[PDB]
């Protein structure tokens, strides 16, 4: 059995999360058993994984110990008719919210919070004593069951939390002591195998959990090396684990030799004999990493992404309008302001020009402030993250990348696959390998926005070039075919 | 069903505890159903009640909610062979103790404490985090099961405790906030009837518990009015409760009218309409209480004690030795130093004179310091509390009372029943009613130790008087026959 250990799945899948799900889906078609492992306690992981993987394709560490691994949404429960009718409570609704303040004849007992406005998903219930101190907090799983009660000291500080199975029995206790005004774990108690287990740390918990999963002939893959690497260090070398680096390995990629390893990858680099091999997306990173590693351990380039069959419309270009697209999380590294600037000084040459920015991150408000400021309300659109952008690549003229560090770009390959050529700063890793300037898009010089504006403008000018590049895009997309990577993965696993 | 609500049973039965058990044993022979109710959380109440009542004669409030009402000692468990063999722990024994320090390969996890030296009764286990902070304490019932985990904050302060049933499910949560450097309850959560219940206070818990017990035609009796009276105040008047006063009702018994009610009985006196009637031991206290109450509610004198069949030896007096006896808890009110003094200045007239002081309280060390100081090692004996003093009344010449306030004296009647006359300061209540000077012992003037010494000396001088008084002792013992009180109790219950 092959295990792809990450942290968890977001509401919006991240680059690492999409890469993991891709490995799983290839291993599915290949015929080899595989499973995603998730370490992070997250009571919405059921909802988050529904449109991508089955509850049997994943084990969550906390679910495992909560005997809630492969549990489904149970039947919905009317919490409000329970409280009113059954409990003879009264429910003062909080205004502009899915919240409530529960009372028993003028005794304030609890503050209820729901996710949804239909009041079907109970999020948390907060408990109060005689003097309206918030003593205890009850968190609920999206599948219904009470997952975790947390106990508060002083200023709503976390003293300890208790994780329950869906039947209500305690399976896990965590004891917090406040270091640097933030709750640090100091004791963990795990009820498992009709026995009591003690760990000082969530890492020690991580290690225990792996040793349970592990049978002889099973293989691990560490994908959030921040958390996964420290967990594997406390695991016997007898247990094979393969490092997977999801990005650039060093702080400044221009200083190949005189640069520290990223805080995230420092642990695995320190214990390089622990890992059977290490996997990057790009040939360059295999070469660069192996030199820095000095060939202590084998390195392989298997790309996080692949091209699949296209059974939606490709390159149906309305000759009157020009759709440019960014498909990138709204984070600072992606430098999406430069694209709003580019569209600023480009409307006068191409009016009825549109830029559709697919993603949701932290820079949402900062980005929105510019599209407003420059009057680009009717030309630039902050389209929320969405999977199945196949209908959204159909009328796309170009893809833009203006990030500075990317590693393999999943959104870059996805563009080429839909025959949409991409104009990207010439950075490491990914764009270099995936783009041949004047083959399937252009490599621009880093942060050289005038070069950027010139080529984007040139490409909007001669559609004969867009069509030529759009062809070669599909061509390049094929070298990363689902077959190319099923084999490439199968060969890698067999050698190990 | 008749319920006799107290707090709990000690290792050593108190006057209130013995009085309650007596009521129960009379109601047994009478044929009316009865049960002791105990409010106090005490995990040794099983052991404490074994030689006096059956687990079906008593309901403990916490046992009730812990689904541990009428549970027996389960089979003994080798905690040390569990920890060594099963858990692969190592057990560093603490010297001069039934304690242990549990370790997992040099990780200090828990401090184990047993009651017994056979290491069969596990008392408590204390839990430690990475930095040897005492985070959590596990208390065990004497019947085996984990009763209560307690969670500690700051300086081993109680933040909250969780009460479990023997199967391990949580039945009760208590949340503490520190007022005046001592843990005060502020929230209680009770899992009962497949529902959640909230109380601010242990009194509110007390009231709830009663309303569950109570069926139509059931009768209550409040015997620790400190705790029981406040509990009954929050109970519907529909529920009959009868006050039972176990002592003198006022702070100074000499100030019948210009004296405050005792802190212990203040609550019932404030809510006198709540109680259907009020029961004292002595006729005098019925008269005194009814005048102070102004006859708002009926008062009855039913004595806490009775005389039973004597099938052990009575008055087998070794003519060469003189055994005097105190049968009184070693507390200050009993003034037992005066008896050590009396024996001091009495050895020279009666050498080979013995005083046997049956009791255990707080004054043990203070009392022992005098028997030592005055060289009375071979004449005065601090015999630990013991029930079945029937073999111990056999060679008794006299009983001494030198207390100042007593109410009915159980040990006084018990003396008379064994034909042992008693010499007692002339106090309220009890001695006045039970002793007729020159009938069955003598009433001495309060704290008049020279009068005391004179009569005790006179009675040791003429054994013809001891025999005459010893007869009339048995005579008086009969007026308080088990039959006299079965009837007296039956008449009282029927009128109500």
Residue numbers in the entry:
A (entry chain A), B (entry chain A): 1 to 496
From the paper:
Two glycosyltransferases (GTases), SdgB and SdgA, are responsible for the glycosylation of S. aureus SDR proteins such as ClfA and ClfB. SdgB first appends N-acetyl­glucosamine (GlcNAc) moieties onto serine residues (O-glycosylation) within the SDR domain using uridine diphos­phate N-acetylglucosamine (UDP-GlcNAc) as a donor substrate. The subsequent addition of GlcNAc to the glycoproteins is catalyzed by the second enzyme, SdgA, yielding glycosylated SDR proteins in which each SD repeat is decorated with GlcNAc disaccharide moieties. The glycosylation of SDR proteins mediated by SdgA and SdgB protects SDR proteins from degradation by host proteases, thereby circumventing innate immune attack.
Despite the biological significance of these two glycosyltransferases involved in pathogenicity and avoidance of the host innate immune response, their structures and the molecular basis of their activity have not been investigated. This study reports the crystal structures of SdgB and SdgA from S. aureus as well as multiple structures of SdgB in complex with its substrates (for example UDP, N-acetylglucosamine or SDR peptides), products (glycosylated SDR peptides) or phosphate ions. Altogether, the extensive snapshots of SdgB complexes in multiple states provided a mechanistic insight into how SdgB recognizes and glycosylates the clustered serine residues in the SDR proteins.
